[PDB]
Amino acid sequence: VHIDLSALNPELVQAVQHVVIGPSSLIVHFNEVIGRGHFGCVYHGTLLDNDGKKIHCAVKSLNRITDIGEVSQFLTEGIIMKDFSHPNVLSLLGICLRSEGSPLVVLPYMKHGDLRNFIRNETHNPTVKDLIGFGLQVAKGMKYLASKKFVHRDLAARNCMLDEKFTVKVADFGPVKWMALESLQTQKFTTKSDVWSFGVLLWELMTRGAPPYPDVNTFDITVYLLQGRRLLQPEYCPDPLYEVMLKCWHPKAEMRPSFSELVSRISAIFSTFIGEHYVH
Numbered sequence: 130v131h132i133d134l135s136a137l138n139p140e141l142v143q144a145v146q147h148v149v150i151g152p153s154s155l156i157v158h159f160n161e162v163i164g165r166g167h168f169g170c171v172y173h174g175t176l177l178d179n180d181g182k183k184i185h186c187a188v189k190s191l192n193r194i195t196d197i198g199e200v201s202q203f204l205t206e207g208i209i210m211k212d213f214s215h216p217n218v219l220s221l222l223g224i225c226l227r228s229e230g231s232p233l234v235v236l237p238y239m240k241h242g243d244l245r246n247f248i249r250n251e252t253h254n255p256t257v258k259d260l261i262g263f264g265l266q267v268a269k270g271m272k273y274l275a276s277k278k279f280v281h282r283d284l285a286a287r288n289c290m291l292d293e294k295f296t297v298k299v300a301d302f303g304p305v306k307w308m309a310l311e312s313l314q315t316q317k318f319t320t321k322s323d324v325w326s327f328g329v330l331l332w333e334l335m336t337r338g339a340p341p342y343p344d345v346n347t348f349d350i351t352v353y354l355l356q357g358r359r360l361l362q363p364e365y366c367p368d369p370l371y372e373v374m375l376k377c378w379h380p381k382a383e384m385r386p387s388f389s390e391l392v393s394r395i396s397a398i399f400s401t402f403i404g405e406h407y408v409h
């Protein structure tokens with residue numbers, strides 16, 4: 130991969146400079162990988178500040194970026210994300226623009242990986258409170274994103290990260306069994322469609338990572354929803370939380386709760402529960 134960085138626009142390169150990091154602070158370990166490939170080609174990295182203080186990070190290689198249009202899109206994506214600062218939204222540590230090799234994305238290392246795999250792992254013992262807690266953290270990261278007027282487009286348990294402190298980090302912003310009714314038939318995406326996906330995400334949490342709609346095909350989902358059928362209440366899901374889920378799957382997007390309202394409602398439910406193995 131050889132990208133001509135001189136073909137990039139002067140004004141956009143200037144705008145991206147505050148997001149750029151390079152070999153004077155970042156060591157990429159190209160011989161050691163992270164994960165199975167859902168998040169792409171990801172390597173271990175180490176970022177150092179001016180005094181030599183080391184930070185563990187994940188370095189993603191954008192191997193499909195070939196032309197200057199794609200690099201330009203990538204830059205702006207980096208600009209947008211670098212502004213974001215919330216405990217429940219994954220940080221962008223920086224990006225690398227290189228003359229040789231694919232563009233790179235630098236994120237803080239997430240010890241416990243993604244949320245779906247954490248909750249499916251039978252050696253972990255989250256309580257009902259723990260799972261509600263994880264859902265509450267997702268809602269707050271989504272509340273911040275919605276306040277910044279950003280549409281996620283791919284919200285699901287698999288796309289939320291878990292750090293060493295068990296802080297949930299919403300990620301992969303910027304999957305038909307997760308899509309709102311209106312997204313499936315009009316291809317439109319809004320904060321309200323993110324709300325539907327959050328409902329499915331909550332359902333995944335209470336089932337500890339069960340696959341949604343196991344007995345309906347991906348092409349039969351639209352009609353299933355139009356017949357007024359919904360995901361069944363999980364064994365460990367309390368009735369008030371199941372109500373929240375059903376409200377998230379309202380056929381009319383505008384009647385769905387906002388993330389502000391969801392944080393409020395889930396916060397109330399969460400406090401009624403006792404017993405937690407993973408404290409954030």
Ligand SMILES: COc1cc2nccc(Oc3ccc(NC(=O)c4c(C)n(C)n(-c5ccccc5)c4=O)cc3F)c2cc1OC
Binds near residue numbers: 166168207234302
């Ligand atoms: C221990 O196991 C793991 C630890 C892990 N630790 C950290 C990160 C991990 O994975 C990733 C998670 C998220 C992303 N990226 C995003 O969320 C991105 C967003 C929102 N934007 C906007 N961009 C973007 C796109 C263009 C330009 C600028 C940023 C992104 O790259 C990348 C990853 F590699 C891990 C995966 C692990 O196992 C799989």
